[PDB]
Amino acid sequence: XXXXXXXXXXXXXXXXXXXXXXXXXXXXXXXXXXXXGSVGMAIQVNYSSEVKENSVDSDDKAKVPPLIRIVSGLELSDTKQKGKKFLVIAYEPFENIAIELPPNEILFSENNDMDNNNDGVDELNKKCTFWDAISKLYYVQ
Amino acid sequence: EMNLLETRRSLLEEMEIIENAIAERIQRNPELYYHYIQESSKVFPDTKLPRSSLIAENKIYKFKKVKRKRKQIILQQHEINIFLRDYQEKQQTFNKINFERKLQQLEKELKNEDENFELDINSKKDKYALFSSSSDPSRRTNILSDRARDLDLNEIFTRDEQYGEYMELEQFHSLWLNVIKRGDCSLLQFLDILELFLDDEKYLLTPPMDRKNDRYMAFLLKLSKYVETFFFKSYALLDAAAVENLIKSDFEHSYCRGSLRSEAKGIYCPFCSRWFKTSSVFESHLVGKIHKKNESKRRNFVYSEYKLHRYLKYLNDEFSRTRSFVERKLAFTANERMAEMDILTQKYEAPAYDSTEKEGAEQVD
Amino acid sequence: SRRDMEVIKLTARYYAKDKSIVEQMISKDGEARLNFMNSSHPLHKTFTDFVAQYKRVYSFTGQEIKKSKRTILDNCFERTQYWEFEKDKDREHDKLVELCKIQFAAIPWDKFTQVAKFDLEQMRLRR
Numbered sequence: 001x002x003x004x005x006x007x008x009x010x011x012x013x014x015x016x017x018x019x020x021x022x023x024x025x026x027x028x029x030x031x032x033x034x035x036x037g038s039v040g041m042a043i044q045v046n047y048s049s050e051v052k053e054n055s056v057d058s059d060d061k062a063k064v065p066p067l068i069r070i071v072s073g074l075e076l077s078d079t080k081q082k083g084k085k086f087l088v089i090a091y092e093p094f095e096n097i098a099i100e101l102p103p104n105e106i107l108f109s110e111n112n113d114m115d116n117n118n119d120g121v122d123e124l125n126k127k128c129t130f131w132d133a134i135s136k137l138y139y140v141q
Numbered sequence: 142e143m144n145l146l147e148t149r150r151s152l153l154e155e156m157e158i159i160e161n162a163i164a165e166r167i168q169r170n171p172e173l174y175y176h177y178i179q180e181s182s183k184v185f186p187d188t189k190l191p192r193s194s195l196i197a198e199n200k201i202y203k204f205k206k207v208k209r210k211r212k213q214i215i216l217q218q219h220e221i222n223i224f225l226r227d228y229q230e231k232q233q234t235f236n237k238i239n240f241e242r243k244l245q246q247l248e249k250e251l252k253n254e255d256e257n258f259e260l261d262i263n264s265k266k267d268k269y270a271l272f273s274s275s276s277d278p279s280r281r282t283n284i285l286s287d288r289a290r291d292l293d294l295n296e297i298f299t300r301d302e303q304y305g306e307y308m309e310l311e312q313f314h315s316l317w318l319n320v321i322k323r324g325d326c327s328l329l330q331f332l333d334i335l336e337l338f339l340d341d342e343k344y345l346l347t348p349p350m351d352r353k354n355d356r357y358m359a360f361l362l363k364l365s366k367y368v369e370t371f372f373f374k375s376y377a378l379l380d381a382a383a384v385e386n387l388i389k390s391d392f393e394h395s396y397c398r399g400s401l402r403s404e405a406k407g408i409y410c411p412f413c414s415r416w417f418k419t420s421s422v423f424e425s426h427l428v429g430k431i432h433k434k435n436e437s438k439r440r441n442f443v444y445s446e447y448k449l450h451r452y453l454k455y456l457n458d459e460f461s462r463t464r465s466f467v468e469r470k471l472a473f474t475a476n477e478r479m480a481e482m483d484i485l486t487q488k489y490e491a492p493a494y495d496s497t498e499k500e501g502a503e504q505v506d
Numbered sequence: 507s508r509r510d511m512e513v514i515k516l517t518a519r520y521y522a523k524d525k526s527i528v529e530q531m532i533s534k535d536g537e538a539r540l541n542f543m544n545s546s547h548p549l550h551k552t553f554t555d556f557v558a559q560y561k562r563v564y565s566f567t568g569q570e571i572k573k574s575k576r577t578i579l580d581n582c583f584e585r586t587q588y589w590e591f592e593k594d595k596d597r598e599h600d601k602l603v604e605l606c607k608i609q610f611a612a613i614p615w616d617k618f619t620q621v622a623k624f625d626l627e628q629m630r631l632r633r
């Protein structure tokens with residue numbers, strides 16, 4: 001696990017370095033959902049219409065879909081106020097996006113599918129995300 | 142009584158199991174199929190064969206599999222042989238085999254013997270197991286499946302044949318010396334004689350001996366039989382009956398129908414050993430008392446000769462391989478010849494699967 | 507387990523022809539014996555198998571299988587090929603996943619810029 005450790009750390013460092021960043025705020029479409037038996041949130045994030053992605057197509061993580069993570073506000077560039085979570089969504093070129101979650105727990109389901117193990121990134125991503133790559137629409141609920 | 146649905150079901154299921162087994166085999170070592178297929182190619186010309194690259198790199202799609210030694214390839218080929226036999230049998234029986242009040246009627250009798258404390262996990266597991274790799278040892282010692290656990294190649298191949306590498310013709314050189322009533326004939330000159338039978342006309346028009354000689358015809362019979370059994374022995378995977386029938390039909394439709402033609406002498410006849418001016422006199426000679434006599438006495442011999450011919454043609458690579466071996470051993474010294482013999486011996490009395498073999502060491506491309 | 511097996515396979519035999527005899531049996535008898543009829547009971551799945559299989563036997567009834575040695579071999583080869591292909595797909599997937607893990611692990615989750623605050627399985631297909 002040592003060699004794998006150095007190697008992994010490496011790839012993660014390199015990949016962390018070359019990360020393109022135009023810091024462009026995409027357009028989110030939050031909407032109060034409901035099913036059964038409780039209430040959950042659903043977000044519809046849209047991306048570029050082959051406007052600028054025409055100059056970069058060298059299979060460099062191009063196959064990698066957007067990624068979401070739950071972050072605690074305990075750590076910020078300003079560190080002023082805090083105490084709530086954010087459902088951050090990230091894609092290589094575009095700028096990160098966050099959504100405040102005051103409710104301690106919503107839509108946090110219980111064994112939705114029948115325990116199939118392709119961790120992807122985490123239980124959250126596989127469990128409740130969809131990436132319409134053909135139309136460039138990322139849904140999250 | 143017995144619901145045929147269940148029986149036919151179990152049949153289709155077992156067939157599936159076998160297909161899956163011999164497919165797993167063809168998977169671990171593609172050579173198994175490749176080898177086979179290549180030979181098939183030169184018997185039934187139509188057969189489509191894989192890309193050469195695949196054959197060489199020993200791969201089926203992307204992963205290049207480890208090369209196996211001959212004894213194992215042949216082994217698994219004979220195992221797959223018996224598997225295909227089973228399959229053919231089941232397919233046969235299957236072909237020959239293919240309300241509510243009765244539902245409750247049977248469900249009632251199913252209550253019979255309620256106190257049957259026993260775990261039953263042995264229908265698909267005993268079959269799947271009955272046909273899988275390494276089914277004999279505790280864990281991993283013998284590649285042979287429980288199905289063919291008493292299958293032994295050494296009872297089919299002699300040590301000098303090396304599981305199809307060579308064909309032992311020394312014995313026939315002996316018998317041959319006994320046939321020619323002299324010793325002017327060396328092993329190599331004998332092989333030179335055999336070569337005649339690779340040609341379509343030589344063995345017929347430039348015979349070692351007179352083709353009406355007794356000793357000669359007897360010898361030729363024994364030899365022919367040997368070559369044929371060797372052929373099918375070394376290529377289990379190919380349908381023996383198919384080949385047999387092919388050859389027989391070639392014999393009837395062409396060979397005995399003036400298949401040998403000369404622009405000068407006309408049409409030669411295997412049975413009477415004479416030529417004929419035109420096809421006309423040739424046909425009106427096939428009803429004559431002479432040809433009736435001969436075709437009625439020397440039929441088996443002619444046919445056996447022919448088989449020796451075509452089977453030796455199909456085995457040209459083995460014939461050459463052996464002749465080579467002969468010349469090598471011949472040009473050895475004492476110590477050399479001894480060590481070589483040691484090698485052939487070890488190859489002969491060695492496990493088909495070593496405790497030190499690889500499983501899952503696939504390369505890419 | 508011979509009992510369970512037998513009842514599964516029998517109700518599967520009848521269920522394969524009509525599907526009406528079992529739906530009547532359930533209402534007529536009222537026994538916790540056929541509790542595998544509901545997709546809740548695990549064994550139900552294997553049931554769906556058996557029936558299918560029997561349904562299959564009904565497919566070529568009156569038709570014989572005349573596969574030859576050559577053909578059987580060719581087939582087993584093609585199956586092998588398939589398995590290899592599938593294996594390759596699995597591999598590729600594993601790779602992509604790896605990439606994802608790397609990038610996820612390697613992006614700034616502190617570059618925040620929020621705006622506001624607050625079934626997919628049949629959706630992750632195509633039609």
Ligand SMILES: [Zn+2]
Pocket residue numbers: 410412413414426427432435
């Ligand atoms: Zn004649």
